[PDB]
Amino acid sequence: IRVDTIKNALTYFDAVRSFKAEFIQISSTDNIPRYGQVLMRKPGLLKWNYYPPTPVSIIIKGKTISYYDRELEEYSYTTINSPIINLLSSDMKNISTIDFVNIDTVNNQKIVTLYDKKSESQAEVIFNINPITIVGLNISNPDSTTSIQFYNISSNIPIDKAEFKHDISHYYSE
């Protein structure tokens, strides 16, 4: 049973090569909906653009993370080598380093649960089917859960690799 579970879970991830979507994000820490736009291009490119009042732009390239705070006009750079961080754009190599996969079927949706033992965090990925699309991502650890839903999704569209940069705009720019 283990092998068929992995193969089938990898099939659902494999169906999404790129996407552009809107997202709503809610953390159990404050229960406040946060909004933005997300771009994903396999392999390894992810952009998270939060809308005001959240002043945050995030570019993930492989495991490197670039964080731009619009209010402070400050950058942060780091690297986290966790299968969970860039799950949405990861190749099959990354997923395979996860310690536990499982698939459930609920209301014509497929829910893939993954568990990384190192970080003690779970992730549920929710797919629609016919056609396969990623509609949600729930990440949980002992302290909190963050739930993300995607909407207005365009899947498997061309996305220029140049699009994976922070949008930094000023009056004097042009």
Q: Say which residue the tokens 């650890």 belong to.
A: 141
- Whether 128 is in a domain gets the answer yes
Domain with 109 in it: 2-157
One-letter amino acid at 17 equals: R
The three-state secondary structure class of 96 is helix
Number of separate domains in the chain: 1
Can you give the CATH number for the domain in which 103 is found? Answer: 2.50.20.10
b/e 63-80 (16+ beta carbons within 10 angstroms → b): bebbbbebeeeeeeeeee
Resolution of the coordinates, Å: 2.0
Backbone phi and psi for residue 11, each to the nearest 5 degrees, phi listed first: -60, -45
One-letter amino acid at 82 equals: S
Distance in angstroms (rounded) separating the CA atoms of residues 173 and 130: 44
- Whether 168 is in a domain gets the answer no
Distance in angstroms (rounded) separating the CA atoms of residues 70 and 74: 7
Chain discontinuities in the chain, listed by preceding residue (C to N exceeding 2.5 Å): none
Please, which residues have CB within 8 angstroms of residue 160's CB and are 6 or more apart in sequence? none
Technique employed here was X-ray
CB 146 within 8 A of CB 138: yes
- Whether 63 is in a domain gets the answer yes
- Whether 147 is in a domain gets the answer yes
Q: Enter the tokens of residue 74.
A: 């400050």
- Whether 166 is in a domain gets the answer no
Distance in angstroms (rounded) separating the CA atoms of residues 120 and 115: 7
Please, which residues have CB within 8 angstroms of residue 162's CB and are 6 or more apart in sequence? none
A 10 A CB-CB count for 136 gives 18
Radius of gyration of the chain (CA): 16
CB 137 within 8 A of CB 125: yes
- Whether 59 is in a domain gets the answer yes
Q: Enter the tokens of residue 140.
A: 């949980």
- Whether 76 is in a domain gets the answer yes
The three-state secondary structure class of 7 is helix
A 10 A CB-CB count for 129 gives 12
Q: Which long-range contacts (CB under 8 A, 24 or more apart) does 168-172 make?
A: 168/68
